[PDB]
From Swiss-Prot:
GO terms for molecular function: iron ion binding; isopenicillin-N synthase activity; L-ascorbic acid binding. Fe(2+) binds at residues 211, 213, 267. Its cofactor is Fe(2+). Binds 1 Fe(2+) ion per subunit. It comes from Emericella nidulans (strain FGSC A4 / ATCC 38163 / CBS 112.46 / NRRL 194 / M139). 2-oxoglutarate binds at residue 276. The keyword Protein biosynthesis does not apply. Isopenicillin N binds at residues 84, 88, 180, 186, 278. Keywords: Antibiotic biosynthesis, Cytoplasm, Iron, Metal-binding, Oxidoreductase, Vitamin C. Monomer. This is Isopenicillin N synthase.
Length: 328
């Protein structure tokens, strides 16, 4: 098993006004997106140590009672409005992973998409403030911190594709973004149940089988335990861990709109018996967002691919990933 080339890219110019320096970042994004599909964003300005510490405190103090109270409908039939946001329970002896997903904090009963009951929009559910002091405040602020990083990364991606820097980011707005944060706990277990370990075709023991991300891009923090692998023509390659940076990759919406020029890399999760964290931010656009596809390989840039509304893409995509990879 070889090692994936995952370059560290200083993205700090994307927050500034030095346009040539932005173009040099964009070139690095282009190169990584055309190679393995992954890079590490460094000098991102987010306190990822606090993120890991607050997430750990939550994961390790939430009780079985609180997990039922917050559970998505896959685990609690009383919560039919919770398809996305809420707690995803572990099943001791069967399913090791557990997680907590939340959406746009601006999705409230006042929001017209909530009033209209549009699919993929939900009001976040939260534990008791007194039992989890500061957790909701931290989690909402983290959403906006990583939103700000993601907006800048989208400027880099736009420039990399020869577009104006707001080509993607203009569709990424606090008032309607369908972006999500997921706080995933992968536990240490002794004994680790074999029922929670899948075996790949090539013999590798996995926690999560191959998939493409349902996103425009994915902005991922992981603790310092190597686990991820990216598929290449020569087979799967290990992505080295870095708990100070963000692992960035394109999702299938980006592959669609670039005519596969920037592929959505196929990746999977090796089984590792180690307590660790996987904290993705899925950069999703608004429900009605449509980006006209193009092909940077053709002089005219023309693509035959149909424009796709993001909301319908996201609804279809999240159902599909459950069916193939299983309920997480
Ligand atoms: C490889 C990943 C980072 S991505 C992969 C997998 N992804 C998902 O389940 C999509 C979650 C979507 C979310 N509930 C929403 O409504 O927006 C997961 O979890 N996996 C992570 C993992 O196992 O670390
Ligand atoms: Fe993924």
């Amino acid at each position: 098993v070889s090692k994936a080339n995952v370059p560290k890219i200083d993205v700090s110019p994307l927050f500034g006004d030095d346009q040539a320096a932005k173009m040099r970042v964009a070139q690095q994004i282009d190169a990584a997106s055309r190679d393995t599909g992954f890079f590490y964003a460094v000098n991102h300005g987010i306190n990822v140590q606090r993120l890991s510490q607050k997430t750990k405190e939550f994961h390790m103090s939430i009780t079985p009672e609180e997990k039922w109270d917050l559970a998505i409908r896959a685990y609690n039939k009383e919560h039919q409005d919770q398809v996305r946001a809420g707690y995803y329970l572990s099943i001791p002896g069967k399913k090791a992973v557990e997680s907590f997903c939340y959406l746009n904090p601006n999705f409230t009963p006042d929001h017209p998409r909530i009033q209209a009951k549009t699919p993929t929009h939900e009001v976040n559910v939260w534990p008791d403030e007194t039992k989890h002091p500061g957790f909701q405040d931290f989690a909402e602020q983290y959403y906006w911190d990583v939103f700000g990083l993601s907006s800048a990364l989208l400027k880099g991606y736009a420039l990399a594709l020869g577009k104006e820097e707001n080509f993607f980011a203009r569709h990424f707005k606090p008032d309607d973004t369908l972006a999500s944060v997921v706080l995933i706990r992968y536990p240490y277990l002794d004994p680790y149940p074999e029922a929670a370990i899948k075996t790949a075709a090539d013999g590798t023991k996995l926690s999560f089988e191959w998939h493409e991300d349902v996103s425009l891009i994915t902005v991922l923090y992981q603790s310092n335990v190597q686990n991820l692998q990216v598929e290449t023509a020569a087979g799967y390659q290990d992505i080295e861990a870095d708990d100070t940076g963000y692992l960035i990759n394109c999702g299938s919406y980006m592959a669609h709109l670039t005519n596969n020029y920037y592929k959505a890399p196929i990746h999977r999760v090796k089984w590792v018996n180690a307590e660790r964290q996987s904290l993705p931010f899925f950069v999703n656009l608004g429900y009605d967002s449509v980006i006209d596809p193009f092909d940077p390989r053709e002089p005219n840039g023309k693509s035959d691919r149909e424009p796709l509304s993001y909301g319908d893409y996201l609804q279809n995509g999240l159902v599909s990933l459950i069916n193939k990879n299983g309920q997480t």
